[PDB]
Write a protein that binds this ligand. Structure first.
Ligand SMILES: C[C@@H]1O[C@@H](O[C@@H]2[C@@H](O)[C@@H](O)O[C@H](CO)[C@H]2O[C@@H]2O[C@H](CO)[C@H](O)[C@H](O)[C@H]2O)[C@@H](O)[C@H](O)[C@@H]1O
Ligand SMILES: C[C@@H]1O[C@@H](O[C@@H]2[C@@H](O)[C@@H](O)O[C@H](CO)[C@H]2O[C@@H]2O[C@H](CO)[C@H](O)[C@H](O)[C@H]2O)[C@@H](O)[C@H](O)[C@@H]1O
Ligand SMILES: [Mg+2]
Ligand SMILES: [Mg+2]
Lengths: 305, 306
């Protein structure tokens, strides 16, 4: 059977699977619900949730603007899949792949390029925001509404949203990275979700790949934590190596010295635990990276951090 | 005992342009006319060249600190760091910090800041910005570029990131020219440490590009950015580092649904593709199609006409 492996990449050579920026650091969290939908992939290469392969697709939208309403979330964007194919709301997914998986405001830019009868080929771009609290944030149903900076220079044309960062809303709705949006809006229940993840062995905590993403005002730290980085997902999708057990023991190595700094459990469904108690930002050498060691079971006892 | 060379298995819509952070839209072969892009450059055995780095989010991005303001259109002086935040060394054997744009034009996107040190550390701001690679202050090799921004009154001398969104022509006779390299050290200085120019070296052959139509911020520009190999291939070759057994790999474009080979192409050691065709031609091929490595050939191999 095909041997399992990780790509060999340092933290600064990794992309966050939940927001399109590099990983900054590793962090282990005290146990308190973690159920992100981007950055979800099994070790044998099955994408889950809203996970797709392109880093530039994460928290992006593609579609057409078709209407406007007299509300702050003004511009109605009918979604396509990121690859431009028609979105099917009956698909067994929580929302179009790449849809943001947190409550907050995503800021970035919208761009348009006209087709058809009105000035075909004409383009425009400007700052925009997508609130995932909005009652018009209904990506599962096939649309989201945009806030934009200049309502007078925007048309009913093919549109792309390119994310840049996140924030709390200015009306006080907070950025909550672990709270899922309502993908079909008010009074609906999310479906086809990747399951929640949590440690299942005493003394263990989740380990995250952490980024501090851009914010657009105020003091928010911009923390987005992912379970496994995008390049690992891309690798597992390519390799599709059979999982020999429920846990891949992995070692964080300093390649300059050859030493193992600590060990961790990489679970079959695509998340990591370590043996530690308390919130702890790791501060480890810049050339460090994980390597696969061996297959173990759920009850393997890790060396403490 | 050579490690077998391979490509990742990815359809066009599962590929990222290595010269701008967007997906590939189509394949295009061009009539012969100089092609010397610096992003998206990697040898088949995994050696990154030019200004190529590994992350799609790094392509046409900048990171550093704004340190000065000048009274000109390109107003805000951004002292660059490497994209990973480490100190940039202008004496390194690269053309410019990795990720620097490799074309003449304007890149538009957003700048964001997050303060450090004593002055309101943790405070943030973000707004639209433009970087003109025609600017005499576009001197990334020397360690800085100047930014145009939307709101000059809300911008500080603090850590800054530029996130690209699209490209455009610049104003009054400075067009977006994807095959014209900027002067990385500014006027009157020669670019150095460049990835080499690429061209077909066999009669009847043309380059094949992975083409994207990127966003533009006004006007009618098509936003065409062509790359030699997509970012995921670069990432793959960097991981694999398979020895190249000749200067030319034969690759076939296959429809996995039918198992049929649609056409063949040469994938050259320095990381670019040629096909046997005459004339500008946008390919129209099945959505599930993808290249697979067939075998190592050589310069004398005559491709079947595309
Ligand atoms: C911390 C600041 O955040 C951003 O500015 C704030 C706006 O985003 C908005 O929320 O309103 C508040 C209050 O006016 C803004 O903060 C003030 O910003 C000014 C500068 O315009 C001063 O810095 C004040 O001290 C803030 O209270 C952002 O644009 C700004 O640059 C700051 O990072
Ligand atoms: C094609 C248009 O491109 C953008 O607007 C143009 C500006 O970017 C700039 O180049 O000046 C020209 C001419 O004034 C602008 O075109 C006019 O834009 C207005 C709307 O603001 C009308 O569309 C006119 O018909 C254009 O000539 C862009 O913002 C705009 O939406 C168009 O795509
Ligand atoms: Mg490994
Ligand atoms: Mg292959």
């Amino acid at each position: 059977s095909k041997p399992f492996s990780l790509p060999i990449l340092t933290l600064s050579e990794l992309t966050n699977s939940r927001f399109p920026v590099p990983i900054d650091s590793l962090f282990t969290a005290q146990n308190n619900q973690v159920q992100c939908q981007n950055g979800r992939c099994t070790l044998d290469g099955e994408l889950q949730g809203t996970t797709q392969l392109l880093p530039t697709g994460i928290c992006a939208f593609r579609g057409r603007v078709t209407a406007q309403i007299n509300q702050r979330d003004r511009w109605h964007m009918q979604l396509q899949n990121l690859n431009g194919t028609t979105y099917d709301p009956t698909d067994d997914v929580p929302a179009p792949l790449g849809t943001p998986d947190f409550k907050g405001v995503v800021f970035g830019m919208v761009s348009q390029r006209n087709v058809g009868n009105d000035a075909p080929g004409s383009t425009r771009a400007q700052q925009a925001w997508v609130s995932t609290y909005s009652p018009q944030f209904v990506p599962k149903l096939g649309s989201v509404n945009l806030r934009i900076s200049d309502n007078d220079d925007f048309q009913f044309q093919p549109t792309k949203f390119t994310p840049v960062g996140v924030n709390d809303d200015d009306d006080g709705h907070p950025f909550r990275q672990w709270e899922l949006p309502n993908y079909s809006g008010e009074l609906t229940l999310n479906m086809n979700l990747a399951p929640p993840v949590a440690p299942n062995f005493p003394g263990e905590q989740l380990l995250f790949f952490r980024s501090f993403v851009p914010c657009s005002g105020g003091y928010n730290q911009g923390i987005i934590d992912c379970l496994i980085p995008q390049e690992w997902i891309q690798h597992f999708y390519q390799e599709s190596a059979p999982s020999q057990s429920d846990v891949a023991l992995i070692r964080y190595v300093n390649p300059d010295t050859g030493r193992t700094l600590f060990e961790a459990k990489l679970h079959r469904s695509g998340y990591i635990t370590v043996a530690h108690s308390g919130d702890y930002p790791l501060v480890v050498p810049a050339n460090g990276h994980f390597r696969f060691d061996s297959w173990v079971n759920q009850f393997y006892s890790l060396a403490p951090m």
